[PDB]
Amino acid sequence: PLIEFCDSVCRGCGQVMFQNNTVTGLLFFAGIFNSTTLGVCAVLGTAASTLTAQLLGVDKPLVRAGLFGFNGTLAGIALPFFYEPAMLGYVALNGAFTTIIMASLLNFLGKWGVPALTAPFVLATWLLMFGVYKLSLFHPGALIAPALPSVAGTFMEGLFKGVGEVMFQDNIVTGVIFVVAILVNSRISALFAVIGSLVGLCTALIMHSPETPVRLGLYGFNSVLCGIAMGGIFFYLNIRTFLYALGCMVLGAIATGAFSVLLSPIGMPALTWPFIVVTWLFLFAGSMFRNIAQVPTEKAGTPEDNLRSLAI
Template identity: 30%
Template sequence: MHAAATEAHSAALRTLLRSLGQIVLQANAFTGACLLAAWLLWEPRLACAAPTGAVAANVSAVLAGYSDDDLHAGLYGFNGALAGLAAFSFIADNATAAAVAILAATGTAWLLAPWSRWLRLRGLDYFSSPCLIVTWLWLPMTASAPSSSTLATAHAHADLASGLLAGLAQTAFAGGASAGVLVLIGIAVASPRHALCALTGAALASAEHLLLGATASSFNAGLLGFNGALTALALAEYGLVWMLGGVTLAALLQAGAASVGLPVLTAPFVAATWGVQWLKQRRALMLYS
């Protein structure tokens, strides 16, 4: 009995950590542990927020009878984790943030099945879109100014290495070069190639934003590179041209949204990746028709 209980607890912990790792598209428990360490280093509130959201989403997935294999891979928990991170990043009061995190994470889990089915029929993956939909519903009503967990100290000049690493940290709502190093290590352990893709995506997107007039302080805060890093990770298996094209599209979408003050979060990454998936499908149909 004791051995069985220990194994069950270990499996639950691995599922939780994989849910965190899926934030950077890695079904790896060590990646999740690295993200947890990054949150502890940057803002301990986030180290509570992400597991809270992941647990709420995973429990909801179990109650809904979702696939055990997908559950253990962290595919149901990561949008919940992101929902928790968003709540604690934009809501200053801890009690309110916790309540919103649990409700929003539960919402992502219940939305996931019908939404992912609709997208799958069109050849698209859901990525962080359930979190985006749920977050956009409460954000206008509840959110205050972003808390310290979403902002980094501004500098007068661009610091290349720190800015790129901060961009990796921002994929998980963290910030700073040290947190970015932990995120990069987590990705590299799961896939060194994916780590290189994430760095490439962050670098290209940041350069394009700076050419479009973004400030050095935004670069140093990691706000220019995170959508590019996520897009590169999502399109890593599509080939270099598709990946770089997707990163460029994500940068353009983010810059356009920023110019009108929209809170897009990871929407440029999701929209750009969907665009590449759609174009690749159309190209394949043209070649074989």
């Protein structure tokens, strides 16, 4: 059981980039392990999420696939980033909430075979983070600030930072390591995750953004998930599939921004929100697309496996 919870926890981390591999997940943790605190709160979150599915009795295939620890980690991290004694507890409370969300979303999105996506991480964190201004147990970082919207008056730092900011990780190194981590399980996923941040970076420049946040990588977080997800994983990789991904990827950044305003008066983070909308938006469309070949979700595997299975 201990080794399984381990093997699960390791898998959930990789699933962050849709990669179901204990190794990639470990390789990912090693990358992020910028802050021992963050790593702890991560393992806490992942552990809670994992341990929870097992207590409510999920299909072992799902837990052991790590599908029940992914959003478990991002709740462990981001409640600390955006620290008190009650920080840990709330992390646990966040991760666990994620689990009910995922189920809730599972059955939900299931009946058309749409994935849950990071949506569990957010809608949780969202709720668990919104009530701060009225629940003074915690006190928030300078990264949060109520304000009505108002108009405003690099490639290397941003590239890596995009991949890291996917984990709220503002480190160039980990970004590299996380990219390498993605390589292990699959070269394809590591590449698509790259084009992700890059397609997000340039798309941001074009739309004319303050070259601060760009290098900060923020406009590469979601893009990186879009590239990794719609990259051979959820759809049989092709040329038309590529342009779709590019398409989505491009879309990712616009939505990132739009989402920043939407929550600007409430001044909270956008979080993974953008990737999960534009994503689910494209997915729900795929089946109607003849030219587009959706990968059967329940069977969807690595871009390579999804290409090897399809071959015959």
